[PDB]
Amino acid sequence: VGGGRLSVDASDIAEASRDFGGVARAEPMAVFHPRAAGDVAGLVGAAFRSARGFRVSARGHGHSISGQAQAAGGVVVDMSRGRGPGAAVARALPVHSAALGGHYVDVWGGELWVDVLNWTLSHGGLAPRSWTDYLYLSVGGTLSNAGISGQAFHHGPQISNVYELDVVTGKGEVVTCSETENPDLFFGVLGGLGQFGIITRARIALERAPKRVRWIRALYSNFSEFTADQERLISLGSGGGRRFDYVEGFVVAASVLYCLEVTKNYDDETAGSVDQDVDTLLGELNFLPGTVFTTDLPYVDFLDRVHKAELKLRAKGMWEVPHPWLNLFVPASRIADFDRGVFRGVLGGRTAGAGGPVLIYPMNKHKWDPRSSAVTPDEEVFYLVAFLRSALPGAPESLEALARQNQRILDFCAGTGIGAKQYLPGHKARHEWAEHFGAARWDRFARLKAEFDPRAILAAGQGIFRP
């Protein structure tokens, strides 16, 4: 426990027993409020030494869909709660390295990306290079998955932009790790679904942040042309050449329409070249003529765009509802078959039927380290397909229909041998985890668990190992 506090307060227990998915409700015995890493070590150590080893799970912002951060009858470590004035003054300044050829910053494992951003911009105009679409997620939470957005095609996911970690293992041991120090734990933890320890520190790579963003959306009716254009755009920038700084897309609720979403970053030095750069890049595209929608805004406002949508949804009582999300990594070689079978088949053209946004965009696997625990398709270019569904509140039939639609999509992929992989997996059954990881990766994953959390105390809500 040390400097930390073990809370049984009704409101803390309630928050720790729920998540964004709004379905899973496993209750903890207590909520731990640490002051520092040693306190998390002391709590995990005590769980490891106890007779009936209680579950310990870290909670970031509680954005999990199916109880991943829940610890039934155990202790939930509230990593993202502010630690007071002394903690805020003690946060590390960005540091320059001549060996790395740039700056990095050490952050608490529970820090929200929005707070990491505000801190680094205020200390040199620096910022992380690779984002999530939503900044009110914890660093520890995203690094336990991958952390993806429109920059991942170029910079890789957030797990490719971290130099070092401090990890509290399932034995309560504080271990510093990186590519050159305890690499098995470092690569194990990155994308490791919280299985091998709690990240108490992360050393994030930084770049000089742009000031403004030219934010563009364009429409397509031809899927083959929409995907050919996204794939061409993600192939640009090799050797720092001319490219867009963000590439996403989404299916439009109208035939089916698709929207390409791109940005071009700029500052005072590059403001003179933006318009010509954008025009050249757009002139090479095949979008429907006259369907370009452009907005110009500060970098921070573009990065926080989803939080702006959240405030609007909260005011309408549309945020705190069930979210039966399904996130897939789909091989580019089978993306046309996925569009036919799912956007035009399962969804029948009306999406609409999806119950919320459906993101679609490709990434470059070479930007992902093959040593990490993250599971990607067995192909170089693969797409995120994100079914960001919201069920109607107080409507059980709405959640049932969306959960069935998820199952049909999964059965379609398995039946036609698509080779898709779930991102933020919610498998829970043993043979499905084996198939998710594959033979070589499952063996490696089980070996890391035996070494780092033999009692299966950590992140039991993921439902991989018997606690």
Ligand SMILES: *Cc1cc2c(cc1C)nc1c(=O)[nH]c(=O)nc-1n2C[C@H](O)[C@H](O)[C@H](O)COP(=O)(O)OP(=O)(O)OC[C@H]1O[C@@H](n2cnc3c(N)ncnc32)[C@H](O)[C@@H]1O
């Ligand atoms: C709700 C949501 C999620 C989201 C998103 C937008 C919204 C509105 N946009 C995303 C995006 O564009 N790109 C992306 O990669 N992910 C996106 N997400 C999903 C999000 O990454 C996940 O929900 C993720 O879990 C992070 O959320 P959060 O920080 O709230 O963490 P958690 O849900 O409580 O816990 C997740 C798992 O990790 C373990 N955990 C938590 N903290 C730690 C630390 N410090 N160390 C180790 N493990 C940790 C939890 O126990 C749980 O298993």
Ligand SMILES: O=C(Nc1ccccc1)Nc1ccnc(Cl)c1
């Ligand atoms: O959730 C998102 N991305 C995500 C989520 C889970 C896994 C991978 C990507 N992005 C996002 C974009 C616009 N509106 C909203 Cl509510 C959300």
